[PDB]
Design a protein around this ligand. Structure first.
Ligand SMILES: COc1cccc(Cl)c1CC(=O)N1C[C@H](C(N)=O)[C@H]2CCC[C@H]21
Ligand SMILES: [Zn+2]
Length: 139
């Protein structure tokens, strides 16, 4: 689990979104596993606007943060789940690191701010949904 709170928005994995998230829907994209809902309180997370390929993510299944090198956002094949059939998930970045399904929502940050959230993993890899291209999160 986990979310990004920026301005009047809450960013979460689309497969983990609540009934309240869907009742206050701003934007969702099944191909990215993202959903953004509106909030009453003012969020203070800073979104990174950069092309960093190094950062640190939070891994709940180890209660630890890990430094990682990660790939550029791209279309990557993802196994079927209770939420999606087998498909290419877009805007995804892979890194070598530990992850388990419940790790989804963990934040990946670089020196500029929030880069994305854990969305996929398996076999010593972890995949992050990018949020740096969503320029409107700041306006
Ligand atoms: C961090 O996730 C894992 C880590 C290790 C192993 C495994 Cl199988 C996972 C889960 C995982 O890959 N996915 C990818 C899905 C997707 N984004 O399409 C998500 C929906 C429900 C399962 C989630
Ligand atoms: Zn950066």
């Amino acid at each position: 689990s986990g979310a990004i709170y920026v301005g009047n928005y809450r960013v979460v994995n689309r497969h983990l979104a609540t009934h309240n998230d869907w009742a206050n829907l701003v934007w969702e994209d099944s191909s990215r596993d993202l959903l953004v809902s509106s909030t009453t309180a003012q969020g203070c997370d800073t979104i990174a606007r950069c092309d960093c390929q190094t950062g640190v993510y939070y891994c709940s299944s180890r209660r630890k943060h890990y430094p990682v090198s990660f790939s550029k956002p791209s279309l990557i094949f993802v196994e079927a789940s209770e939420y999606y059939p087998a498909r290419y998930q877009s805007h995804l970045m892979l890194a070598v690191g530990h992850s388990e399904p419940g790790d989804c929502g963990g934040i990946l940050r670089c020196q500029h701010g929030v880069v994305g959230i854990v969305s996929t993993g398996g076999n010593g890899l972890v995949g992050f949904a990018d949020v740096r291209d969503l320029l409107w999160l700041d306006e």
